[PDB]
Structures are given as C-alpha cells and as structure tokens.
C-alpha cells in the first residue's frame, strides 16, 4: 500500500461506522497529473484501537481488491499510520452509500434505475468471479454512489463496490448472526464455508435492498429469530417492486452449488 504522509491528511466530520471501525470524511494534499497540487476529499476508515487484533484482516480486505482495477470497484489511495492509528484512505463521494441513497430518494427511484444499478453490481461481481476473488461482504452499505441519474444528458446512476472490511472468517459469532440475511446459511453453520458462492447469496440480499428503498431485510428479527429464519428455510418477502423477486430467490438458494454464475445473472438482468 502507498503510505500517505501524516502532514498530508486532515480528518474532517464523522460519517458513520463499519464493523469495528469509525468512518470520517478527510482531505488529502497530493501531487496530481501534470504536477498540479490538489486538496482531494477522501474517505477515512479507522480501525478501533480496542480492536487492533483485527488489523491484518482490516488491511487485507482492501489490499486484495486494490490489486485489481475495474470501473465498478472503489479506488484505494493508501494507508496512514499517524499516531499508531490504522487508517485506510479511499475515494470519497458526496452522495454517500447506496443504502442511505435508496432511502432518501425512495419516491424518485423507479424500476429502470434499480435495474441499471443491479447490472453494475452484477458486472463488478462477474469481474471478481472471473478473477476467483471472494468479496465476502456484499451489501448496499458497502456500495458508493458516484453519480446520480442525469436526465438532461441521459446519464444513468453509477455505483462502485467498496472493500468487505474485516472477514467473516475472523469475526465473532454474534456479529455474523446479526448479519443474516447477508451472511448465507452455510457461513452461519461454519464461517470457513466462505466461498465464491457466498457472494451470489449476498448479491441476492443486496438486490432485495435495492428493490426495497433502503429497508433492511429481517431488521425486525433479533439474532435468535434470524437463526430460526434459516432453520425453517424461509425466503425473503418479494419486494413491492417485484420485477427482480425471482432473481433474488434464485441467488438466495440454500444449496450454494446451485447459485447461478454472475454471467447467468447478467444475462437474466439483460432479458428484463
Ligand atoms: C457507511 C458510510 C459511513 C460510508 C459509506 N462509504 C463511502 N461513503 C462516502 N461518502 C459519504 C458517506 C456518508 F456517510 C455521507 O453522509 C456522505 F455525505 C458521504 N464516500 C465513499 C465511501 N466509500 C469509499 C466506502 O467504502 C463506503 C463504506 C461505501
């Protein structure tokens, strides 16, 4: 990872949190194209000091994906270790995460907008699958909205998938249970079951988020009830905008071996 000088990074407002992390907006002073100096807005992910035991998984999460370049994958700028802190520096967007965007703009987002964003997420996932790279935490909170729909130019919305954060293979059981239904049943049985098939299930859950205006599936269920949901082999309810209901259920197949390839997912989205 590129090491960003302490003097070149400034912390601004708190934006939220991730698993064992605090997230901030920041500013980075950098030499850019043609030697032009820029003050670039950045997203700062800071690992909690109390959870330093996860530093390897925290950085490995961003490192493996940073080795790849794709139009729908987040840009990583580097790391900063100012005051012994573990800080990930990534690109910043004013529009925030997809989950909050869906909720704030629920009355203005139609089926074509949802289909476009689903195709883009499926494109990123197909790229990762072709590279045999497991993501392991596909969800709308981990997706950034780069550009809003622009009807004046006919430009569609544009998204990028960010890194998965600390791996479910090292997280406490209680966190994984809270993550149902993004975490598939086989990973609840054993987190060592993390596989490319995991991402097909989580993509199904993320598509449900996209179709539900930022509602969180099973948010009314506590962890014990979330376990019962899997025990009784339930399926998520069809979203009110049900055009993608069949695809969500086909992805969220209790048999990991039967989950369709991302190439088949793209062809299904293209046939809508
Ligand atoms: C969940 C949230 C705290 C962080 C969401 N998030 C990001 N959010 C922003 N912008 C932003 C976020 C806001 F929360 C907000 O209020 C706002 F105005 C702007 N830019 C980039 C990313 N990147 C690189 C990322 O990995 C993810 C995790 C997808």
């Amino acid at each position: 990872f590129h090491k960003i000088r302490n003097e070149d990074l400034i912390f601004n407002e708190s934006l939220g949190q991730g698993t064992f992390t605090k997230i901030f907006k920041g500013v980075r002073r950098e030499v850019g194209d043609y030697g032009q100096l820029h003050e670039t807005e950045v997203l700062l992910k800071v690992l909690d000091k109390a959870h330093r035991n996860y530093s390897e998984s925290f950085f490995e999460a961003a490192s493996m994906m940073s080795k790849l370049s794709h139009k729908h994958l987040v840009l990583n700028y580097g790391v900063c270790f100012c005051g012994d802190e573990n800080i990930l520096v990534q690109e910043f967007v004013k529009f925030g995460s997809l989950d909050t965007y869906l909720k704030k703009n629920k009355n203005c987002i139609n089926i074509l907008w949802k289909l476009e964003v689903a195709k883009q997420l499926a494109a990123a996932m197909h790229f990762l699958e072709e590279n045999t790279l497991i993501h392991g935490n596909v969800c709308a909170k981990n997706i950034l909205l780069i550009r809003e729909e622009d009807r004046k130019t006919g430009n569609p919305p544009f998204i990028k998938l960010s890194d998965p954060g600390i791996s479910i293979t090292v997280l406490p059981k209680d966190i994984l249970q809270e993550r149902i239904p993004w975490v598939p049943p086989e990973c609840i049985e054993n987190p060592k079951n993390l596989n490319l098939a995991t991402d097909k299930w989580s993509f199904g859950t993320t598509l449900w988020e996209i179709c539900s205006g930022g509602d969180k599936p099973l948010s009314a269920l506590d962890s014990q009830r979330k376990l019962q949901f899997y025990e009784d082999r339930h399926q998520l309810p069809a979203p009110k905008a049900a055009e993608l209901a069949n695809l969500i259920n086909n992805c969220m197949d209790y048999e990991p071996d039967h989950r369709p390839s991302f190439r088949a997912i793209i062809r299904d989205l293209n046939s809508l």
Side-chain angles (χ1 to χ4, degrees), residues 28-47:
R28 181 201 176 185
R29 194 151 172 250
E30 62 174 347
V31 176
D33 290 350
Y34 314 102
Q36 187 39 243
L37 266 158
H38 302 106
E39 277 262 276
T40 304
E41 293 178 328
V42 298
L43 192 275
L44 300 170
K45 288 173 170 162
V46 185
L47 179 68

PDB file of all heavy atoms in Angstrom, residues 28-47:
ATOM      1  N   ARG A  28      -6.897  15.225   1.614  1.00  0.00           N
ATOM      2  CA  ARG A  28      -5.542  14.813   1.323  1.00  0.00           C
ATOM      3  C   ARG A  28      -4.932  15.819   0.364  1.00  0.00           C
ATOM      4  O   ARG A  28      -5.544  16.140  -0.661  1.00  0.00           O
ATOM      5  CB  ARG A  28      -5.547  13.417   0.689  1.00  0.00           C
ATOM      6  CG  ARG A  28      -4.169  12.873   0.367  1.00  0.00           C
ATOM      7  CD  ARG A  28      -4.263  11.792  -0.669  1.00  0.00           C
ATOM      8  NE  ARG A  28      -2.932  11.324  -1.066  1.00  0.00           N
ATOM      9  CZ  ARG A  28      -2.712  10.441  -2.032  1.00  0.00           C
ATOM     10  NH1 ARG A  28      -3.728   9.930  -2.720  1.00  0.00           N
ATOM     11  NH2 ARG A  28      -1.477  10.068  -2.325  1.00  0.00           N
ATOM     12  N   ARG A  29      -3.723  16.289   0.684  1.00  0.00           N
ATOM     13  CA  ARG A  29      -2.988  17.219  -0.170  1.00  0.00           C
ATOM     14  C   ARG A  29      -2.060  16.319  -0.990  1.00  0.00           C
ATOM     15  O   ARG A  29      -1.312  15.529  -0.412  1.00  0.00           O
ATOM     16  CB  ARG A  29      -2.219  18.237   0.690  1.00  0.00           C
ATOM     17  CG  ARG A  29      -1.703  19.442  -0.074  1.00  0.00           C
ATOM     18  CD  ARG A  29      -1.618  20.644   0.852  1.00  0.00           C
ATOM     19  NE  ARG A  29      -0.943  21.765   0.209  1.00  0.00           N
ATOM     20  CZ  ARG A  29       0.263  22.210   0.542  1.00  0.00           C
ATOM     21  NH1 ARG A  29       0.941  21.639   1.532  1.00  0.00           N
ATOM     22  NH2 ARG A  29       0.805  23.226  -0.115  1.00  0.00           N
ATOM     23  N   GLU A  30      -2.175  16.359  -2.326  1.00  0.00           N
ATOM     24  CA  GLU A  30      -1.405  15.449  -3.183  1.00  0.00           C
ATOM     25  C   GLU A  30      -0.950  16.065  -4.484  1.00  0.00           C
ATOM     26  O   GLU A  30      -1.633  16.936  -5.027  1.00  0.00           O
ATOM     27  CB  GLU A  30      -2.239  14.169  -3.491  1.00  0.00           C
ATOM     28  CG  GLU A  30      -3.545  14.423  -4.253  1.00  0.00           C
ATOM     29  CD  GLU A  30      -4.325  13.201  -4.708  1.00  0.00           C
ATOM     30  OE1 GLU A  30      -3.770  12.079  -4.659  1.00  0.00           O
ATOM     31  OE2 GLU A  30      -5.495  13.368  -5.124  1.00  0.00           O
ATOM     32  N   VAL A  31       0.172  15.553  -5.013  1.00  0.00           N
ATOM     33  CA  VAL A  31       0.683  15.923  -6.332  1.00  0.00           C
ATOM     34  C   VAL A  31      -0.095  15.065  -7.328  1.00  0.00           C
ATOM     35  O   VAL A  31      -0.091  13.839  -7.217  1.00  0.00           O
ATOM     36  CB  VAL A  31       2.218  15.744  -6.473  1.00  0.00           C
ATOM     37  CG1 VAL A  31       2.682  16.042  -7.899  1.00  0.00           C
ATOM     38  CG2 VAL A  31       2.954  16.642  -5.490  1.00  0.00           C
ATOM     39  N   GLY A  32      -0.768  15.723  -8.261  1.00  0.00           N
ATOM     40  CA  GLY A  32      -1.607  15.068  -9.252  1.00  0.00           C
ATOM     41  C   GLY A  32      -1.037  15.108 -10.641  1.00  0.00           C
ATOM     42  O   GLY A  32       0.168  15.343 -10.810  1.00  0.00           O
ATOM     43  N   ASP A  33      -1.909  14.928 -11.653  1.00  0.00           N
ATOM     44  CA  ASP A  33      -1.481  14.944 -13.054  1.00  0.00           C
ATOM     45  C   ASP A  33      -0.838  16.275 -13.391  1.00  0.00           C
ATOM     46  O   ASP A  33      -1.292  17.321 -12.904  1.00  0.00           O
ATOM     47  CB  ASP A  33      -2.664  14.696 -14.004  1.00  0.00           C
ATOM     48  CG  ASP A  33      -3.225  13.279 -13.989  1.00  0.00           C
ATOM     49  OD1 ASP A  33      -2.588  12.394 -13.379  1.00  0.00           O
ATOM     50  OD2 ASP A  33      -4.292  13.061 -14.601  1.00  0.00           O
ATOM     51  N   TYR A  34       0.261  16.233 -14.188  1.00  0.00           N
ATOM     52  CA  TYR A  34       0.991  17.416 -14.617  1.00  0.00           C
ATOM     53  C   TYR A  34       1.628  18.183 -13.426  1.00  0.00           C
ATOM     54  O   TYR A  34       1.982  19.344 -13.554  1.00  0.00           O
ATOM     55  CB  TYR A  34       0.117  18.328 -15.518  1.00  0.00           C
ATOM     56  CG  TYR A  34      -0.653  17.591 -16.599  1.00  0.00           C
ATOM     57  CD1 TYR A  34      -2.013  17.327 -16.453  1.00  0.00           C
ATOM     58  CD2 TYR A  34      -0.041  17.226 -17.797  1.00  0.00           C
ATOM     59  CE1 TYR A  34      -2.733  16.664 -17.447  1.00  0.00           C
ATOM     60  CE2 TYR A  34      -0.753  16.575 -18.806  1.00  0.00           C
ATOM     61  CZ  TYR A  34      -2.100  16.294 -18.623  1.00  0.00           C
ATOM     62  OH  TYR A  34      -2.818  15.658 -19.608  1.00  0.00           O
ATOM     63  N   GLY A  35       1.767  17.505 -12.288  1.00  0.00           N
ATOM     64  CA  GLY A  35       2.371  18.082 -11.096  1.00  0.00           C
ATOM     65  C   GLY A  35       1.501  19.090 -10.372  1.00  0.00           C
ATOM     66  O   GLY A  35       1.992  19.797  -9.492  1.00  0.00           O
ATOM     67  N   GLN A  36       0.198  19.150 -10.718  1.00  0.00           N
ATOM     68  CA  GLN A  36      -0.741  20.080 -10.101  1.00  0.00           C
ATOM     69  C   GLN A  36      -1.020  19.614  -8.680  1.00  0.00           C
ATOM     70  O   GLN A  36      -1.202  18.422  -8.459  1.00  0.00           O
ATOM     71  CB  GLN A  36      -2.058  20.165 -10.922  1.00  0.00           C
ATOM     72  CG  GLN A  36      -3.068  21.248 -10.466  1.00  0.00           C
ATOM     73  CD  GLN A  36      -2.466  22.580 -10.039  1.00  0.00           C
ATOM     74  OE1 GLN A  36      -2.585  22.991  -8.878  1.00  0.00           O
ATOM     75  NE2 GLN A  36      -1.809  23.293 -10.956  1.00  0.00           N
ATOM     76  N   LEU A  37      -1.010  20.542  -7.713  1.00  0.00           N
ATOM     77  CA  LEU A  37      -1.328  20.190  -6.333  1.00  0.00           C
ATOM     78  C   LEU A  37      -2.849  20.258  -6.171  1.00  0.00           C
ATOM     79  O   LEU A  37      -3.482  21.215  -6.627  1.00  0.00           O
ATOM     80  CB  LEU A  37      -0.677  21.139  -5.328  1.00  0.00           C
ATOM     81  CG  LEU A  37       0.670  20.741  -4.755  1.00  0.00           C
ATOM     82  CD1 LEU A  37       1.406  21.980  -4.243  1.00  0.00           C
ATOM     83  CD2 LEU A  37       0.509  19.754  -3.620  1.00  0.00           C
ATOM     84  N   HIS A  38      -3.430  19.231  -5.559  1.00  0.00           N
ATOM     85  CA  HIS A  38      -4.871  19.167  -5.313  1.00  0.00           C
ATOM     86  C   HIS A  38      -5.099  18.918  -3.840  1.00  0.00           C
ATOM     87  O   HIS A  38      -4.256  18.323  -3.176  1.00  0.00           O
ATOM     88  CB  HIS A  38      -5.544  18.031  -6.121  1.00  0.00           C
ATOM     89  CG  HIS A  38      -5.353  18.116  -7.604  1.00  0.00           C
ATOM     90  ND1 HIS A  38      -4.492  17.257  -8.269  1.00  0.00           N
ATOM     91  CD2 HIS A  38      -5.911  18.958  -8.506  1.00  0.00           C
ATOM     92  CE1 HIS A  38      -4.536  17.612  -9.544  1.00  0.00           C
ATOM     93  NE2 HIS A  38      -5.363  18.640  -9.740  1.00  0.00           N
ATOM     94  N   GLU A  39      -6.249  19.377  -3.340  1.00  0.00           N
ATOM     95  CA  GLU A  39      -6.752  19.134  -1.988  1.00  0.00           C
ATOM     96  C   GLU A  39      -7.945  18.269  -2.313  1.00  0.00           C
ATOM     97  O   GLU A  39      -8.949  18.762  -2.843  1.00  0.00           O
ATOM     98  CB  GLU A  39      -7.166  20.441  -1.295  1.00  0.00           C
ATOM     99  CG  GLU A  39      -6.001  21.184  -0.669  1.00  0.00           C
ATOM    100  CD  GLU A  39      -5.858  20.938   0.820  1.00  0.00           C
ATOM    101  OE1 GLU A  39      -6.546  21.628   1.609  1.00  0.00           O
ATOM    102  OE2 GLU A  39      -5.063  20.048   1.199  1.00  0.00           O
ATOM    103  N   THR A  40      -7.758  16.955  -2.180  1.00  0.00           N
ATOM    104  CA  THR A  40      -8.752  15.958  -2.563  1.00  0.00           C
ATOM    105  C   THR A  40      -9.525  15.455  -1.359  1.00  0.00           C
ATOM    106  O   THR A  40      -8.913  15.035  -0.389  1.00  0.00           O
ATOM    107  CB  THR A  40      -8.051  14.778  -3.278  1.00  0.00           C
ATOM    108  OG1 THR A  40      -7.297  15.272  -4.386  1.00  0.00           O
ATOM    109  CG2 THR A  40      -9.030  13.700  -3.767  1.00  0.00           C
ATOM    110  N   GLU A  41     -10.852  15.417  -1.464  1.00  0.00           N
ATOM    111  CA  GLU A  41     -11.706  14.829  -0.418  1.00  0.00           C
ATOM    112  C   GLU A  41     -11.500  13.325  -0.460  1.00  0.00           C
ATOM    113  O   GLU A  41     -11.371  12.730  -1.551  1.00  0.00           O
ATOM    114  CB  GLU A  41     -13.193  15.172  -0.643  1.00  0.00           C
ATOM    115  CG  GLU A  41     -13.464  16.662  -0.452  1.00  0.00           C
ATOM    116  CD  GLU A  41     -14.894  17.106  -0.696  1.00  0.00           C
ATOM    117  OE1 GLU A  41     -15.571  16.505  -1.562  1.00  0.00           O
ATOM    118  OE2 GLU A  41     -15.339  18.065  -0.023  1.00  0.00           O
ATOM    119  N   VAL A  42     -11.367  12.715   0.726  1.00  0.00           N
ATOM    120  CA  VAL A  42     -11.110  11.271   0.860  1.00  0.00           C
ATOM    121  C   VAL A  42     -12.022  10.675   1.941  1.00  0.00           C
ATOM    122  O   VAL A  42     -12.527  11.400   2.790  1.00  0.00           O
ATOM    123  CB  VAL A  42      -9.621  10.963   1.174  1.00  0.00           C
ATOM    124  CG1 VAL A  42      -8.692  11.439   0.042  1.00  0.00           C
ATOM    125  CG2 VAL A  42      -9.182  11.568   2.508  1.00  0.00           C
ATOM    126  N   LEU A  43     -12.189   9.347   1.913  1.00  0.00           N
ATOM    127  CA  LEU A  43     -12.952   8.606   2.902  1.00  0.00           C
ATOM    128  C   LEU A  43     -11.899   7.909   3.781  1.00  0.00           C
ATOM    129  O   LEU A  43     -10.986   7.268   3.269  1.00  0.00           O
ATOM    130  CB  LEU A  43     -13.854   7.562   2.178  1.00  0.00           C
ATOM    131  CG  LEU A  43     -14.945   6.864   2.970  1.00  0.00           C
ATOM    132  CD1 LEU A  43     -14.447   5.652   3.713  1.00  0.00           C
ATOM    133  CD2 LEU A  43     -15.850   7.833   3.726  1.00  0.00           C
ATOM    134  N   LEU A  44     -12.000   8.112   5.092  1.00  0.00           N
ATOM    135  CA  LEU A  44     -11.041   7.568   6.042  1.00  0.00           C
ATOM    136  C   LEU A  44     -11.717   6.485   6.858  1.00  0.00           C
ATOM    137  O   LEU A  44     -12.686   6.759   7.558  1.00  0.00           O
ATOM    138  CB  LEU A  44     -10.499   8.684   6.968  1.00  0.00           C
ATOM    139  CG  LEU A  44      -9.778   9.855   6.266  1.00  0.00           C
ATOM    140  CD1 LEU A  44      -9.493  11.013   7.241  1.00  0.00           C
ATOM    141  CD2 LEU A  44      -8.497   9.412   5.601  1.00  0.00           C
ATOM    142  N   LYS A  45     -11.196   5.252   6.781  1.00  0.00           N
ATOM    143  CA  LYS A  45     -11.711   4.171   7.613  1.00  0.00           C
ATOM    144  C   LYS A  45     -10.654   3.933   8.687  1.00  0.00           C
ATOM    145  O   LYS A  45      -9.497   3.650   8.363  1.00  0.00           O
ATOM    146  CB  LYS A  45     -11.968   2.903   6.802  1.00  0.00           C
ATOM    147  CG  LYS A  45     -13.168   3.009   5.878  1.00  0.00           C
ATOM    148  CD  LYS A  45     -13.270   1.775   4.979  1.00  0.00           C
ATOM    149  CE  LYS A  45     -14.580   1.755   4.234  1.00  0.00           C
ATOM    150  NZ  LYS A  45     -14.515   0.837   3.061  1.00  0.00           N
ATOM    151  N   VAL A  46     -11.046   4.082   9.954  1.00  0.00           N
ATOM    152  CA  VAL A  46     -10.114   3.949  11.073  1.00  0.00           C
ATOM    153  C   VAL A  46     -10.491   2.749  11.901  1.00  0.00           C
ATOM    154  O   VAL A  46     -11.580   2.726  12.480  1.00  0.00           O
ATOM    155  CB  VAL A  46     -10.128   5.228  11.947  1.00  0.00           C
ATOM    156  CG1 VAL A  46      -9.062   5.159  13.051  1.00  0.00           C
ATOM    157  CG2 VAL A  46      -9.938   6.480  11.100  1.00  0.00           C
ATOM    158  N   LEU A  47      -9.570   1.778  12.018  1.00  0.00           N
ATOM    159  CA  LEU A  47      -9.835   0.603  12.848  1.00  0.00           C
ATOM    160  C   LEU A  47      -9.880   1.006  14.324  1.00  0.00           C
ATOM    161  O   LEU A  47      -9.016   1.749  14.766  1.00  0.00           O
ATOM    162  CB  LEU A  47      -8.755  -0.464  12.619  1.00  0.00           C
ATOM    163  CG  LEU A  47      -8.903  -1.739  13.447  1.00  0.00           C
ATOM    164  CD1 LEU A  47     -10.144  -2.530  13.009  1.00  0.00           C
ATOM    165  CD2 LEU A  47      -7.653  -2.578  13.347  1.00  0.00           C
TER     166      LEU A  47
END
